[PDB]
Every structure is written in structure tokens, then in C-alpha cells.
């Protein structure tokens, strides 16, 4: 990769936290820190869970009524965004945003209410549904 991706973790100081022993669902509440690598998140509620027999295939969501995300993007095209929920996946590109979802980068800005983004990158997509599921 580069170097630093296992010196700086996701760090979480917290008040109203819980950590399960069995499936290992985790939740933080009321006051929560979230920073990692070159990224910051702000939230009142944070959750992390593991669809993982293998590791780093963990999934995280953050809620700040609205939550916000901030990224010093590698290539000199930094980005930040805001939504009722924000989401990330720990072996993966993908961020997703829902409820009043807004993002702005050197490449583009978008308002919508259901938007996906790629942390390695400068590209975004909105998914205007009509029962397509």
C-alpha cells in the first residue's frame, strides 16, 4: 500500500459504548471519537460489525443527526460530506451516505439523499430508486 495503514488505526475514545463477546457487534453513543489514517468522522452514534470469518472485512456506520465525513485525499483532491447516516467498509473502497446526503471535492459536489463514494478516489454516484429491488 503506502506505510502508516497499521500504525494509525481507527481510534475511539467514548462515553456510552458497548462491545459484544459472541458476534462482536460494537456500538458507541453520546460522545465518540473517530479518526483513521487521513480521515475524520463526526457522529453521536457509531456502530461496527463483522461479516468476517476473514478479517478487515468489517463494516462501520456513523450517525450525527447529521453525521459528517472528512478525507485528506491522496492525490491533492480532498473531500468532505454530510448525511443522516454515513458508512464505510474496512478492506474496501466504498463509503455510502443516506438522508440529506451531500459531498464536495475538487472534482465535483452533489446534493441527494442516497449517495456512494470511493475513498481512494474523486468519484461519486447517486441512486434514484423507484422499487428497483
Amino acid at each position: 500500500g503506502k506505510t502508516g495503514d497499521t500504525d494509525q488505526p481507527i481510534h475511539i475514545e467514548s462515553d456510552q459504548q458497548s462491545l459484544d463477546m459472541q458476534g462482536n457487534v460494537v456500538t458507541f453513543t453520546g460522545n465518540v471519537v473517530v479518526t483513521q489514517g487521513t480521515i475524520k468522522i463526526n457522529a453521536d452514534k457509531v456502530v461496527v460489525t463483522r461479516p468476517g470469518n476473514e478479517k478487515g472485512k468489517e463494516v462501520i456506520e456513523g450517525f450525527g443527526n447529521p453525521a459528517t465525513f472528512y478525507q485528506m485525499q491522496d492525490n491533492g483532491k480532498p473531500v468532505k460530506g454530510r448525511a443522516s447516516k454515513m458508512r464505510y467498509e474496512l478492506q474496501n473502497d466504498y463509503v455510502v451516505l443516506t438522508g440529506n446526503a451531500y459531498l464536495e471535492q475538487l472534482d465535483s459536489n452533489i446534493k441527494g439523499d442516497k449517495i456512494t463514494y470511493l475513498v481512494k478516489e474523486q468519484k461519486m454516484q447517486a441512486f434514484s430508486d423507484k422499487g428497483r429491488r
Binding site: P9, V26, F28
Partner: peptide, 16 residues
């Protein structure tokens, strides 16, 4: 990246 969280009731930490 790893996750590394700290609990109010011990002031000390774990990985995930």
C-alpha cells in the same frame, strides 16, 4: 486499518 477502542470504565484499550 485495525480498530483500537478504549472503555470509560477502565480508561484502557483493545483492538478489534
Amino acid at each position: 486499518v485495525p480498530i483500537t477502542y478504549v472503555n470509560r470504565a477502565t480508561x484502557k484499550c483493545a483492538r478489534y
